[model samples]
Target chain A: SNQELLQLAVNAVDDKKAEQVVALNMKGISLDFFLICHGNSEKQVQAIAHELKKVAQEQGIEIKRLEGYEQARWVLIDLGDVVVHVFHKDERAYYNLEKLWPTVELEG
Target chain B: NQELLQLAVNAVDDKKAEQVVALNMKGISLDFFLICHGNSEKQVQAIAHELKKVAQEQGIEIKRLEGYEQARWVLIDLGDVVVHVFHKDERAYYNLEKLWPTVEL
Candidate 1:
């Protein structure tokens, strides 16, 4: 249960207020959480990325890979258990990743 | 996810754009593809300009642009790169992401 949907919900809403929420099901890799987030500013976006990196390290989670950090406005942190999104508000709204994947269910 | 895909759909209208999206599926379609919400109409205009500049750097040109500086939504067409910069309340009210999922994103 911890590594399944429940954990996915936890990672999905890291910065609850940011509203950068999403989940991608990578069944092949058995990686269920594609957690996503968005920031209001470039600084805030980058900060979220740093926070994820630190937290994952602290938790002893190993990242398979990461990209888009140079563009703090849209950073991606990939922990095998959960993928984090740090986005600007516009990004969260503009490119609605949640909408594109029309198959995920959010937690109540 | 529908809105995001919709935005992508509305932005890119050419065959070349389709190729671009297919080519950079992971980074372009999967990762973040947000429109920078500017503080004001002028700022929105700046965002549109900046988007073109950023995408152009990759040899991509905007297919089209809609919505005025004053409007709540500023639709920008970046071939496979699409965006819709919206205001704060508007962003919350729509909550587009909550409505869609399972995008290549």
Candidate 2:
């Protein structure tokens, strides 16, 4: 089920043409899985979040929490077991997010 | 510094942010660490937004904002004053106050 959720989120990001999409498996602490991706500007970053939320709603995924649309520099979505982060190109480079947690990159 | 600190503390309390604490980081990276938390994601964002909005209205520069998307821990950077509006779920886990001396609000 998490795999399907992750795939749908990935597809949603792809729909918005997000760059360098990444999915990682967390070691039961950060989350079950953490999905990372980036967009070029404010509007694009918000669009990716919109698409992901749309797909999640269609699949009955309750977005437990969401942040970043107001500023759009970084948009984070929490889907129970998984968390998706869509950052602006510049913001993405500002922090090495994955390094905050131990994870194994899962290929899509 | 006290003026801006007081302004930020009042801003968050107006939005019902709990345990408002201002850590004196005079020799530290940021001059002050204004820490507080809200019970919900919307509330957390609201607190962060309110602090930034109120500060800006008073001519304070908002330099950076990090971790608002999940509203778990939103860091609002204002040159000399760095405010952290966090969700109640993650506040104590970070233990920020342990390292810095606190000032009365």
TM-score per prediction, in order, is 0.43, 0.49
For each candidate, what is the lDDT?
Answer: 0.51, 0.77
Which digits, one per residue and each the tens of the lDDT, describe model 1 over residues A1-108?
235532533453364445646555544423255666677777776766766666567666776666667766556666655566566776644464432333246553
Q: Write the per-residue lDDT of candidate 2 for residues A1-108, one digit (tens) a residue.
A: 368778788889899999988787764444167788888998999999999999999989899888767777777898877788888887732253522335445563
Question: What DockQ class does candidate 1 belong to?
Answer: incorrect
**What RMSD value applies to candidate 1?**
11.7
The count of residue-pair clashes in candidate 1 stands at 19
CA lDDT for candidate 2: 0.77
Return the interface RMSD of the candidates, in order shown, one decimal each.
9.7, 14.4
Model 1, A83: alpha-carbon shift in Å? 1.9
**In model 1, where do residues sit more than 4 Å from their true spots?**
A1-17, A26-31, A92-99, A102-108, B1-105
B59 Cα displacement, candidate 1 (Å): 35
Scanning candidate 1 chain A in windows of ten residues, the lowest lDDT window is A94-103
